[PDB]
Write a protein that binds this DNA or RNA. Structure first.
Length: 66
DNA sequence: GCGATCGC
DNA sequence: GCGATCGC
């Protein structure tokens, strides 16, 4: 029940971490896709503004071996 | 341009 | 196959 705030295309947006499908890092930017009502939405935030919970999801993605 | 994806 | 995007 953690919300992530970001600005994609001028607009401000919030998505519950529960709808995030994938997370990854590019420098100090935490990037992700989420379930945008059936389709793939994209967003990113500074690691400085990443809710702890999103950072935990990132660490988990970075731990990945698949 | 990185990572990754969408929309061409 | 690359530009726009996001933050840097």
């Amino acid at each position: 029940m953690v919300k992530v705030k970001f600005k994609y295309k001028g607009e401000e947006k919030e998505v519950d971490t529960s709808k995030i499908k994938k997370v990854w890092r590019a420098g100090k930017m935490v990037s992700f896709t989420y379930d945008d009502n059936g389709k793939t939405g994209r967003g990113a935030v500074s690691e400085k503004d990443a809710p702890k919970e999103l950072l935990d999801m990132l660490a988990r993605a970075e731990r990945e071996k698949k």
